[model samples]
Structure formats: C-alpha cells, structure tokens
Target: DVSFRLSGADPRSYGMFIKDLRNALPFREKVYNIPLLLPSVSGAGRYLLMHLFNRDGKTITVAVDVTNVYIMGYLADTTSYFFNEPAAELASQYVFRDARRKITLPYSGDYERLQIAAGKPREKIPIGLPALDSAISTLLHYDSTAAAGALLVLIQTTAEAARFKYIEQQIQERAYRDEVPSLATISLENSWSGLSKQIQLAQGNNGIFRTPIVLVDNKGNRVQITNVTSKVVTSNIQLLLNTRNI
Candidate 1:
C-alpha cells in the first residue's frame, strides 16, 4: 500500500504543498479529487496520512515534511525503491488487482539512484504467521482449486466484530455454504499490536478497507492476493463468488 504522510507546522502552506504534489502526479481525479482524500488542516506539525498505490503495486510511502516546500526527493526507509522488490511486487499485485485501477509510484527513481550511489541495501519484510497463516489455512481448507478460490476474513476490533456478526449472516445467506470465510476478533482488553499495521490500514476507511486482500497459500508456498475489499464483506464475497465456479 502506498501512502503520503504530510507533516508541517504551518496550516496554510499545506495547501500549496498538496497542490504542487498533486500536479506532479498522475491519477489526480480518482485518487486525489473524487475520493476526497486530503490532509487535515488541524494540529500543526502533526502527520496526516492518505493512501496511494504505484504502478507496480508496491508501497510508495511519501513522507513529506511540509514545513518546507521542496519535493525533497525520497525517504531512505519508507519509500518503495529502498525496499526489496520481488516480495513487495508480489504483495502489491494483490493490492492493485483488488483496487481495479493501477497507480504510478512517484520518486522511486530518485531514491533508487541515491541509494545505489551511496552503496546502500534494499529491505524485505518476512512473510509468516497467524494473520497470513490463518487466512491461507482457512481459504485453502474451504476451497483452493479454482482461479479465485480465495477467502476474505477479518482481524478486527470487538465492536466491529459485533457489526460483522450481522454482516456474516448476510454473507452466508447469499454465498454458498462453504464460500464465506470466518472473522477474527481482537479484544479492547489487551493492547495487542498483532495486526496494528493492518488495523491502521483499515482505519483509512473507518475500521474497514476495500481491496488488496493479502493471504498466503500452502500448496505453492506463495502469497496470494485479491481486490476483495473487506469493508463490505458481502459485496466482496459476491465479487469473489462471481469470479469462481461457485
């Protein structure tokens, strides 16, 4: 997932910063204008985040220190170019396919050149465990022979779990008996960062996100992805159901 985090002390300067940034990028209408994803005007020097996707589907996180008005190139850590490409590209494909529209990553070449000049290394995120493991296990168990034999599950807050209870019933009614994936819950009682990053991603859409469904499969030892946005569980379920033999 690509994101733009704009941080600055001044309120008014953000307008120009965003305008200049917008002008430099493509897909201004879909990502910037219609979706109405903009940085908040409150809280000086605080970071306001918005989501974006690049052409390759990898995360192109642009951290803008809005105190100044220069492109400032790219960050050594978060920008896509500094990260390992093979795995990141695979993850991004799932995200991109689910979103339906692909986006271009800005500032990648600038950082790639800078890193290579400095003789730096690219990074990779290890793929494993409960979230990845459970999603794959469930989907694989349910069905995995077809082209779109992926399951859509939720690892969410308890409050949201209650909402999904009703939502699950709806999905069950519409989808085949084996088609619906079960929900995973997190309690407010403990401060578990188990899916903290994913939770933050979900917060972009009010505790639910649409597209870029990530899962790992055991058969091929591969990470599979889809654009079945889990915000509206049933709608995504319907989309997946339509894609498969059912």
Candidate 2:
C-alpha cells in the first residue's frame, strides 16, 4: 500500500504506491511528502503533449504522458541512503518503510463513473477521462506521470515483479463494468501472417551500435517471395534477406 498526501499542509509524497506483499511491508496511506524533491509542474486547463528521448535514445512523442513532472525521479530502494537520504536526509528527509499493501488514488477516486457514463464494462473503462477515451489512453497517462513516481517518500510499500501489474489488479477489478469486454484486450496491433514486410530494420549485438536486421526466409521447395531481391540457397534451412547498398 502507498499513500499520497497531495492535499495536506505538510503534503508528503507526490506519488502513489501500487502495492506490496512482503512480510516487511507496512500499512498503506502513509504520506511522507516526497514530491517536493524535484521541480514542480502544473497542468493548465488545457492539454498538451511533448516528446523526448527515452533511455533507449528513441525520439518519440505522444498525446499522453506528463513527463514534465516525473524527472529526477527514482524508485524506492533500501540501498541508496541510510540507505535513504531523501534529497539530503536531514530531520526533514527521512521516511521509513510502511507495511500497508493497498493505497487509494488521490484525485481519481474510484473512476467507475467513466464506465457508468459510457454504458460499458469494467475492462471497457477508457484511460483518459471517459469523455476523452477515444482520444487518449489514460492507462498510459497515469503511468507516465504520478503512477511512475511515488511511494518513495512513504517508503513503506511497493509491488513485486511490477507495480503496473499490481495496479492493474486493482484497476481491472473496479473500472467501469457495464457488461462489455475488457477494453484492456483491445490494443492496437498488426496481424495477418505474423509478418510485417519491411525493407530495412536495425539490430545490434553486444555493442551499442544497431545493425540492420538480417532476415532469412527458408522454403524447402516452395517459393517464398521478397521484393526487389535475389535468390541464394544453402543447407537444410535457408537464410535470405535483401540489403540495398546503392
């Protein structure tokens, strides 16, 4: 469990905890005022999107995600300071771990009303405000911002394996349940032969530099087709890919 004290005078912890099941866990709802460590960001009455390089150095942008708030954020770990040392541990910088395993959302209280308004099922509950489900995935939004950074202040609870999965358990059970399928199931995808035709893609080895992917399509006797390519056969299974240098 994790607590977010966004509304209190000594508002401790700016993030929410998904859950924790360890024997060493503490009670939930213990706000310790951690969001104060970084720069403060605010949401205008309007919405906007920004892009940045991910840890993998991929240039990206999206309609969701509030990265303006989650910078300089690190998840909880007992090995960093005391091991604590929240923003320079002074009398004001120490938060002990708690045992609680379930925490409530601070601003978005039991968002079932989204489904209630949409006549959908629990899993059908959309990510953004129900009014904007068709426009953005609130699922990814919450994750990008508050959900990604918290529980460090309370230092009492956390999830095992993945906090997303734990949060999902809670989100799954309680979202809009208007008697429809899980909106969770309907993710965008590409299908039809489990193969996407691409002329060029990159892959790399132990080093950081990425090399273009080398594909091999093998056919015993039947003819497999590739665009603007040549043919070379060698051995039991075959490896073939068309690389253009001109």
Candidate 3:
C-alpha cells in the first residue's frame, strides 16, 4: 500500500549499488520501497551556457564549464561547513540540516551577472575581488556555507574580474588610447562585441537571459533547473552544503 520509489539515471554504469539494494529489499509486501535506476536519464558532467544583456540591449553569452572534479570538491567542502557549525545554534535553527538540503551549482543568477559585466568596457567593470577573496578564504578555512555563497558571488562577478584584468593588461602594454584603438583595446572591444551579438541572436524574444541551474538531490540526482523555484532551491542548497563541509 505504501511505496517509496527512488528513480534516477546513472551515467557511470555503477548500477550495482542500487541493484544490490533492490535485491536485498524485494517487492513482496504491500509496502513496496523501490529504487529505480534509469540509464537513459543520467547525466555525466555539468556544462551550461548563459546569456546576459545590458540596459542598452547589448547582450553577452557566457559558457560555464564545470566538471565532476569541481562538484565532488564542492560537496566535500560543503559537508565540512555543516559539521563544524556550533551545536547550540544548530538545534534551534537546524542550520546544518537545512543547509545540507539546499546546496547546488552553476549559480545561474551569478552567471547572468557575469554575462552583463562581460559586455561592458573595462573602465566600467565592477569589483568582484572582495567577494572572490571572501569565498576562497572561507573554503580554505573550512567555512563551506560561506564559501559556497562567496563562490556564487565570484562566479557571477567573473565578467567584472575579466574586464579588470583586461584593463590592467592594456595599461601595462601602454595601449590606453582614447580614439585610436590599440591592440588591447581592439581585442577587448571585438571580444565583447562578438559575444553580445551572439547572445542577442540566440535570445530573440525571451528578453531575460537565463542560465541552467544545477542541483544535487538527496537521492544523488544531479539536475539542471530551468524554473524559478528550482533555481532558488539550488542556490540555498549550495550555501548550506558549503557551510556544513568547510
């Protein structure tokens, strides 16, 4: 009468674990707890493409390339954050538990911001170094939740960082020309312009440039989110996981 079903896709062909579990717990009784593994539905690695636009309608597309290595590392770090939280606070807030339930990846919102930043000129770039530093420090210090939050910020602010670097390099090359475009200026302008045009063509009427959201469920389901709520959940989970682990 009561059945608990766990369905997922495994790309690695590591279905033995689930298969063994299913064998141990047969579907004999009224209450059937079935864990179904679907090879067709599984995903291997994480890679996402995001598009962003500015007030002037200039758009930029950013490709976020993520690997299993980074995901594994992030998960490990997030777990540490939870385990280290003060016990007194954990009881009331369920901070660790809640966090564990919420960590996710690809940070769609940040990706969009990065795209916007990427389209702008170097001088107009934002300062994301503080947030990036904070995240790296948190990860190093085992403050996983803070680290995760910081990471999201860092990922989104990447465009700003790139712009900054581009400018610095230009200055170093002494190619800061107001009108006559130097090598650095030409390169930056072309790259930004090209990226923007590509995004605009890809996003004809959507208006908003959205990135796919990455999520890791309790059942070990790594999913990409396209909806609003799923995106929020992904962000929440990522923060919790980081705090718990680091």
Candidate 4:
C-alpha cells in the first residue's frame, strides 16, 4: 500500500490514485497530488483547480464522478492481469489449442482447377488460395505480436506464457494500441540493462522470464515458428503510470 498527503492554507489541495487490476490482482498502481500555490503579487487571490498528474506520472481521479466537484481517492489494486470470466478463459484455450494444429497447403492441382476444372464452380475454383493466404498472414502477424507482447508482460510481472497469450489475444480482439509514444519500447530496453540485477534479486529463477514460451507452426512436417531467442523488455514506467489516467 502507498499513501500521499497535501496541506496548505487554501482548501483546494487534492490527491488521487489509479489502479489496474485483473482478476482481483494488481498489475499497476500510482498516486497523484494537487498542491496550492500563491503568486508574489501584492493582492493575489486564491483559486482552486485539480492537479491532473504528478511528476512521477500517476493519475489522480475518482472511479466515478459527482455533481460539480470531482472526488479524489487511491485505487487499492492497480496492476493485476487475471481474467475471471469463464467465456474469456475458454476462448483463450480454444485459440491456443487450435493454433497448435498443423497447417496444410492445397496442391497445385487445386490451383489449376481454377482455370478450367470439371464440375468446379467459378467462385469455388479460387477458394483455397485467397483464404489460405489471408489466414496465414493473419496468423503470422498474430504470432509476432503475441511474442512481443508476451516478452514485455513477462518482464513487467513475470507472468506465464499462457497469461501473456491471453493478454495478447485480448489486445488483438480489442484493438488496443499503446497510447504513449515509444514508452513500451523504452521500458523494455531499460529492463535489459537491469536483467542481471532482476535475476539476482529473484527468490528463484522460476517466473515467466526464466521460462519462455515458444510459438511454432508445423507446416507439412516442417516446423517454422518464432524462436524464444531473446527476453522481452519491460513496460515503460511513464506509460504504465499513465494508463489509468488515460
């Protein structure tokens, strides 16, 4: 738990906290404060305004709003990533299972049938090629992004590969994008600098960072997959801090 306080002669000192949690677990937490200041003028009047964010990049706002004044309070848990919904959990399992199956390509004869094959409808002739291409492309893109996001999440929370995969799928389905520019990349790089330190500080090398999850594509007995070649970088401090506020 974290605490913050503000005191001044004026009545407008305010503070807030943002929390991001999943399945009752905390993944990120931050505190923000608003201070009262007076100018050097002779007859400066006092006014009150909400302080939006702190220098440390925490957002200070309430979960809900009231009539005229905005309430300020800290979030109890801000950085947990566990989904409690049964449907979501099932969907994640389905994707993971289906992705493991081998992908097969249509033979050249099927392609030749497009030009002029007996009993073949004009539309059905090109069926395998376009769908196959699109599916392959989408899967490859998903795989790459999943790998990247998984690595990052692991560095941040030492979450497991399955957890990372779940998050990756959620991001894709929701079309979530990094709002803060260059924050994720920067955070990951910083984590690299302190990688050895993190290992030393660990109780045991048993978290997600210690064990990587690999994605593979077994195409006609030829396995082509994204190798867990390098560790993923951590999340950007500024970005994580600002997530709740945004």
Per-residue lDDT, model 3, residue 206, is: 46
Candidate 2 local lDDT, 152-184, one digit each (tens): 111111121112232233223322321222322
- Ranking of candidates on lDDT, top first: 3, 1, 4, 2
* lDDT value, residue 169 of candidate 4: 28
How much lDDT does each candidate structure score? Answer: 0.25, 0.21, 0.28, 0.22
- After superposition, candidate 4 runs with Cα above 4 Å error: 1-185, 189-193, 199-246
- CA RMSD (A), model 3: 20.6
RMSD of every prediction: 20.0, 20.8, 20.6, 22.9
All candidates: TM-score: 0.17, 0.17, 0.23, 0.16
Q: Name the best candidate (by lDDT).
A: 3
What tens digits encode model 3's per-residue C-alpha lDDT throughout 129-217? 23333334444444433444544443433322222233323222321122222333333332332322222322443433244434333
- Runs off by more than 4 Å, candidate 3: 1-73, 76-108, 111-131, 140-149, 156-195, 198-246
lDDT of 2: 0.21
Candidate 1's C-alpha runs over 4 A off are 1-9, 28-81, 87-246
Query: Native-vs-model 4 lDDT?
Result: 0.22
Which candidate, 1 or 4, has the higher lDDT? 1
- The most accurate candidate by TM-score is 3
